[PDB]
């Protein structure tokens, strides 16, 4: 366990299990998952890596994902080039996820955080779930990380929050 | 552990957790789970309890709550008064898979075998998710259990092994 931190470089050997998206939004369109080397990813350009405890978790509680949709112009505008969604649901039920959203392109990407692999090396998972925070990296370096404890809040991992901490590098 | 065979009582205390249909098939409704207390509802009745090792699973490996679904009429002229649908998959994303399929009803419901531990209870669970398996209720007894381990296969727990058994008695 190391808390990550401005500065920390981002974790090497870090990879989760995805469906490459297909540009369908079909829930029964077939699949395969395989490896996304997130490390690799992360080592050059602006990345977005958002957790969350669960996909499928009901709007009423939970306007997480949408706002970083309905704001995806203004995170381009900033200078990212890639959004991740993870989770520790697999990656099967997190392409679906992805397509219940509207995304069928790679906008934004949705992964499986495998036995919350990743989350739990840098202390933010809890019985099987990862926890609901947001990391920001630019060329292998974390710039912002942070977690939202608050159950329902979004203050921390949000896209407000992440526009915010662009407009400011 | 105990392996359930044919004239055993269906085991006491056995509830699942689900997201009652509304019946909507939008996948951005808000629910909330409630427990499902299958060994009350078994008690009476013919019953099919049905586990799947993973909710979304693509169709090109699997074909098991499709074939259910296509033969619902079926299932209802030979006295089926309740078919269960379980994976270790939480609520809000069986109630997701659910509505995927096209079910707005009770028709078939789709219910969580938290930590797998009805499934583990009876030898059926492994690694965190139940086998794929089916049994057949009347009045509180099993009257059919049987369990697919070839990978891809429903011919002990597809629909077809489930019609036959009813077409018995």
């Not at 200078?79 to 219940?100: E, T, Y």
Request: glycine share 10%; charged share 20%; hydrophobic share 40%.
């Amino acid at each position: 366990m190391a808390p990550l931190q401005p500065g920390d470089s981002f974790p090497a050997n870090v990879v989760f299990s995805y469906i490459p998206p297909t540009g369908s939004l079909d829930l029964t369109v077939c699949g395969r998952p395989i490896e996304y080397n997130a490390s690799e990813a992360l080592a050059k350009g602006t990345s977005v890596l958002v957790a969350v405890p669960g996909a499928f978790t009901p709007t009423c509680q939970e306007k997480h994902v949408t706002g970083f949709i309905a704001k995806l112009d203004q995170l381009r505008q900033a200078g990212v080039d890639r959004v991740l969604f993870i989770a520790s649901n697999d990656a099967f039920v997190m392409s679906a996820w992805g397509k219940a959203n509207g995304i069928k392109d790679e906008s934004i990407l949705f992964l499986s955080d495998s036995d919350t692999a990743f989350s739990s090396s840098i202390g933010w998972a809890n019985a099987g779930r990862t926890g609901r925070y947001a990391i920001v990296v630019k060329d292998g370096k974390v710039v912002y990380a942070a977690v939202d404890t608050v159950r329902g809040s979004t203050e921390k991992s949000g896209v407000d929050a992440v526009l915010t901490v662009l407009g400011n590098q």
